[model samples]
Target chain A: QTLLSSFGTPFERVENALAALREGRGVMVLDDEDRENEGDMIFPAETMTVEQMALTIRHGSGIVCLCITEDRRKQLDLPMMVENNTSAYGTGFTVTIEAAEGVTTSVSAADRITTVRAAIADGAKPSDLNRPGHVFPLRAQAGGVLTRGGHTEATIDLMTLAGFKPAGVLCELTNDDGTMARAPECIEFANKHNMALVTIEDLVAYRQAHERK
Target chain B: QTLLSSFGTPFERVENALAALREGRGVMVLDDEDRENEGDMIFPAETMTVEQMALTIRHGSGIVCLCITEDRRKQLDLPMMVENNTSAYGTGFTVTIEAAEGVTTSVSAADRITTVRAAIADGAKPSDLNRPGHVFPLRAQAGGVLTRGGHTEATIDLMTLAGFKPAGVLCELTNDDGTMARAPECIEFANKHNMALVTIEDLVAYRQAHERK
Candidate 1:
């Protein structure tokens, strides 16, 4: 599929995408239309590995997010854009995050694209979507994974229902203009989470070290 | 201030702006910063007159939205864009519209920028925010008027608290990208509500009939 191409074409591509992910090197994906709109930069939500998640924060200059399917979307009562009647851009929703005890944070679904990316970059987990302040299951009961865009809550729920462990979350951080802006708190958040926060620069450097020969 | 400039500057400008509005000629407003981002097209929310609201729809090409004050925003628990640890862009909230019993709707505060404009273009009153789908009062009890961009419910409630009757509702309409896309049901909606549905072309024709030298 075209999506797998981002990993690399065919077997080698999937292998590279998976290996990179396993090694925590997040692979970047782009949609043709997104590229046309200067939105070519996006990270896959479901396929990425923890290492990539960690590396993305340290080296990439954008935010990460979780994405989900349409059915999962409607079940959550999230609003869709009126024009195409799709929430593909991750435009709306109110994300509720429970920390511990009474400690909970509510981020508007509108701000979820950025806020969630920032949170996860700072060391949040997909489980954070549920019992955030408490230690939650890393893999959802269902084998499905999550994305950072829209439908964070519903995605988590559906994953738990589908009987699949959520492998890992995928994320992307790009602005409306198709540019990248490092969230101001990315480094601080990553350090707090004790995760390796790499950037595009670091990933490129890693590629050079491993593949240059 | 830039905002007042949107309403029209100085006394004479306000007069011209009002006259144009009274004649059903809507003015287009844009933020200087927004202009750089293809966001140059916008409609006046609370400031423009009803005629202007209609005119804007027929003539302008962008989304219209309500603009409001910071204090007014806080009362509604709407989300604001975070800039320097503050809600920049006045972002947040979901507005619930309770018209007649079964004729209710909800608009995300995020989508309000365009949805509110479209609603006004379809002949909804600011009081429609409080009581849509029925002949609710046009003005609030506070003797103040409402705009299109932001602060709908709070504006209505505050006006009631002030013990003044809402004088009227102001509205505007524009597109996301400065292009015109007619609402399929605007005329039908206007007819149903017994509201005047004028267009910019109609306003211009009226000017030629009465004031053109």
Candidate 2:
């Protein structure tokens, strides 16, 4: 039980990952091998705290993104990063943002958390945020996991079902050794920290069971 | 004599762009419309002084990349960012780096310039850099402009032919109005600053004529 885990079933693994996210903790998500074969860390956006943000920034060592529903993006008047965009995944990136009222500089983990909270707040509006700030926002496909199956889609879908904001904070995990955390490395990390590690397969199945309506 | 009129004929325009690069100045490059249709400000790497870096960072408002020849990259033992990387343009990004010799912190125009200088130095070795630092290095294709018509190749090719180090600093231009600069806007900026503006087409032609050896 020390740093090695098997939830036995995909169902149980997804539940475990969701439980961690529900408690403002991080969960590692492994995508399809044919795709990035990459792993990521995701947090329910509304619950992401300074500790979680710091952990992701320091260890995840990747782009820390605030992913939200496309509808939410339109409501805030946020523009996609570019047209006929050049991103690897056809680029849903929006202008980077910082919390207008609650932050000093945009680089710190605390400031990023503040920005995320401000973005997903119930009454969040166009003017409540500032652009070209530290945190990058990604526009999730309207269909979530059923349509896209990438980290951005899976993260927000999980948060919505978990009763948090339909938004999540995501960062790709990096081996402290400066390599991307592949599937085995992701498992090793999860065991080391007793954290939950699930796959996009688990998330899709979880949603298909409960979100079919 | 005001902000109007061309250099007349493609020859003078290309020469003007080369002259600017050799003089440690910024030149604007407009890429193909079928591609990014994006405009970038490029500086010869060896001559990229603090002033040029500041102007690029301040108004260019894009990722500042240090692009160099693939041979130089291997000499320094720099690895491409990831195996099966996910960056757009098939991603030649290597580990991010900082100047271990002279820089105090990684951000700031002065530090970035220092890092670029160290990276392109004749005696530069891998030890002179600290990874996961500020500036990102883009490994240019071996055949340069002839092989690929993108800015990464064009910038480095320009640097090589301009009699400077085969490296260049590039940033995508953004209008102060906070939009990606298109062809018209690119021309407008060049006129405003009286900086030389050239195109990928011009560079390809310039290389074919001068580089056919």
Candidate 3:
């Protein structure tokens, strides 16, 4: 989104994101609110190249992560889509550009946030916003990414409280409020004991949204 | 302390932890607040294990962490020491515990609102903690563990923002406050470069203190 945002305003971000969107790449930013229902984008640990990122965004990729920090952005030379969009708790920037139109369909009300972010990414289609399946917010920090790529590793600091466990591929399927779902291990574990399961689209979406996987 | 706290409470945990501490094995929690200091028990990620942990905090052994949250203490079944009476962010629960006549030290501050915890598993002394030496935070998020034993083919999620690159081992050298130390590139690519450069001991210390390193 910053890539487009660098072109100009939110309106401009929407336009460039649209060019990518029409070609199958749907652009959306992480939301600012830490809403109750939503999944967060997880990225690969390695620094991705812009060319690699362009390829992933242009074509739905997988397990890709964009290491976006104030410093990383400058280091990677990636454009910032939203200005003054900093959060102290922000682990950094991330988004999945290929979460498919129908992904977030279960939660229409919640989809507004996604649509607005995507609008900021590529222009809002009232009709387009209606279909909510898997839309990550522009700057949300309540979620995490899971990937098994050789270059990236994830360690979840399990707090006895909320940060207790990391998300694995196939959690016990604890809760599913339309687009919102969770894995149940009683306590959070790393990668579901042995198998980490994520939806096909989510896996693809994460990959596609990353600067490079 | 998860190993001990995993048992749920002191009634069930303290004894086991004591038993482990009774031996040569000791436990130490990690943090990256001041990457230049040392602490008692420094276990590399590669050395993590239920059995290995049992061996670290042996008889006459002790534990130390910068600060343990109220919830972490309860969940991990951690015991309170004399210094477990402070907080860095007004959250409280931060404590400093010295075991076996100043053989171990644990320091907890409230600034660690996020869970990127690092724990040490070994026999160390306050000399180690107060020892003047080079220390660096590992960048698991960037790529690579800060210690000698992390295996499992996963990069750490948190690392020092100082100058150490991916390949450069994490360490602390003499430097003024506010500015991070800088060193030559340990490894470099034509297009990009990053690395860490430090000795086994320094790397060991980092793993012990790094949050989720």
**Candidate that would win on lDDT:** 2
CA lDDT of each candidate? 0.29, 0.71, 0.23
Error of 2 at A72 (Å): 1.5
Question: After best superposition, candidate 1 residue A101: deviation in angstroms?
Answer: 22
Native contacts present in each candidate (fraction): 0.00, 0.00, 0.00
- DockQ (CA atoms), all models: 0.03, 0.03, 0.01
Q: Considering TM-score, which of the candidate structures 2 and 3 is the better prediction for this target?
A: 2
TM-score (C-alpha, index-matched) for candidate 2: 0.52
> Taking the tens digit of each residue's C-alpha lDDT, what string does model 2 give over A1-46?
3122455477777788778777766788776433335577888887
In model 2, where do residues sit more than 4 Å from their true spots?
A1-5, A33-36, A211-213, B1-213
Model 3 lDDT per residue over B1-213, tens place: 432233334332223322333332322212222333222232223222333322222210111112212332333323232122221111121111222122211111111101112212222222222111001122122233342223110112111222111111111111122121222211111012111112223334444555464
Model 1 alpha-carbon drift over 4 Å, by segment:
A1-7, A14-92, A96-118, A121-142, A145-213, B1-9, B15-41, B44-92, B95-213
Tens digits of per-residue lDDT for model 1, B82-148:
1122122222322322222122112212223233433333444433333111111121212122222
What would the per-residue lDDT of candidate 3 be over residues A109-200, giving only the tens digit for each residue? 12222322332332233333221112222221233333321111121101101122221110011111111222222112212222122222
What is candidate 2's lDDT per residue for B1-213, written digit by digit as tens?
Answer: 312136445556678888987776678887643333558888888777777766665556435788988888987777665454322245466655677776642445676788888888898998887665557788988898799888889888778778887889987775444345667777777778767887777778877887567
Q: TM-score of model 2, chain A? A: 0.90
- Chain A agreement with the truth for model 3, given as TM-score: 0.23
